[PDB]
């Protein structure tokens, strides 16, 4: 059982998520 | 059992999600 | 059992999702 | 048992999903 | 048992889905 | 323009969905 | 324009969703 | 424009969602 | 433009979500 | 523009979320 | 007289998991 | 007279996990 | 007379985990 | 006379974990 | 006469963990 | 000699939104 | 000799929003 | 000789928002 | 000789917001 | 000889906000 992962990212301008996990509620009652 | 994954991304301008997991509720009651 | 996956993406301007998993509720009660 | 997959994408302007999995509720009660 | 798959896509302007899986509810009660 | 809807449900044991909207990806690349 | 909706549910044991909206990714790359 | 909604739920034992919106990633790279 | 919503819930034992919005990542890289 | 919402909940034992918004990462790199 | 809807549910028994 | 909706739920029993 | 909604829930029993 | 909503919930018993 | 909402909850019993 | 796959994409132009 | 896959993408131009 | 995968991406130009 | 993967990305230009 | 992975990224330019 062997798992290998490789990631290479190049970003000029970032306004969002890269390799990220985001949670937002924004709920209304 | 062997799993290999490779990722290469080039982004000029990012406004969304790249290799990301996002959750948004935006619910209304 | 062997699994190999390769990904190469080039993006100018991103407003959505690339290699991403997104969840949105936007429900109304 | 061997599985091989290769992906190459070139995107100018993205407003939707590329290699992505999206879920949206948008339900109404 | 061997499975090989290759994908090459070139996109100018995207407003929908490319190599993507999308789910939308949009249900009404 | 008038819309009227009425729902009545009686459930002993639930393992699935009742009056629900579910989305599952379970995709593989 | 008028919309009226009524819901009545009785549940003994719940393991799933009742009047709910659920999203699950469970994707693999 | 008028919208009216009424909900009544009786639950013995809950292990899932009632009138809820849930998001789960559970993704793998 | 008028919106009216009414909710009444009775719960013996709760292990999940009632009238709630939950987000969980549980992602792996 | 008028919005009215009413909530009434009775809980014996609570182990989860009632009228709540919860976020959990639980991610792994 | 009914000009709307009448829904009746009656269950006699027990639920065991 | 009913011009709306009437919903009735009656359960006689016990729930055991 | 009802021009709205009437919802009635009656449970007779006990819940044991 | 009801032009709104009427919600009633009645539970007779105990909850044991 | 109701032009709003009426909510009633009645529980007879005890909760034991 | 090819026993696999060869995919070639060539685009000459510009994309304007 | 190729027993796998070769994918080539070449774009000459500019992207303007 | 290739028994795996070779992916090449070449972009000549500029991105302006 | 490749029994794995080879990924190459080349971009010539500038990004302006 | 590659039995793993080789990743190369080259960018020539500047980023201006």
Swiss-Prot record, chains K, L, M, N, O, P, Q, R, S, T:
Residues bearing PTM Tyrosine amide: 17
Modifications the protein undergoes after translation, according to the UniProt entry: Amyloid fibrils are degraded by insulin-degrading enzyme IDE.
Ranges in a coiled coil: none
Residues that span the membrane, as ranges: none
Subcellular location per the Swiss-Prot or TrEMBL entry: Secreted
Recorded family membership: Belongs to the calcitonin family.
UniProt free text on domains: The mature protein is largely unstructured in the absence of a cognate ligand, and has a strong tendency to form fibrillar aggregates. Homodimerization may be the first step of amyloid formation.
Functional description taken from the UniProt entry: Amylin/IAPP is a glucoregulatory peptide hormone that plays an important role in the regulation of energy homeostasis. Selectively inhibits insulin-stimulated glucose utilization and glycogen deposition in muscle, while not affecting adipocyte glucose metabolism. IAPP function is mediated by the CALCR-RAMPs (AMYRs) receptor complexes. Amylin can also bind CALCR receptor in the absence of RAMPs, although it is more selective for AMYRs.
Quaternary context: Can form homodimers. Interacts with IDE and INS. Interaction with INS inhibits homodimerization and fibril formation.
Record's miscellaneous remark: IAPP is the peptide subunit of amyloid found in pancreatic islets of type 2 diabetic patients and in insulinomas.
Name of the protein described by the UniProt record: Islet amyloid polypeptide
């Amino acid at each position: 059982t062997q798992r290998l992962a490789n990631f290479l990212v190049h970003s000029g301008n970032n306004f969002g998520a890269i390799l990220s996990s985001t949670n937002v509620g924004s709920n209304t009652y």
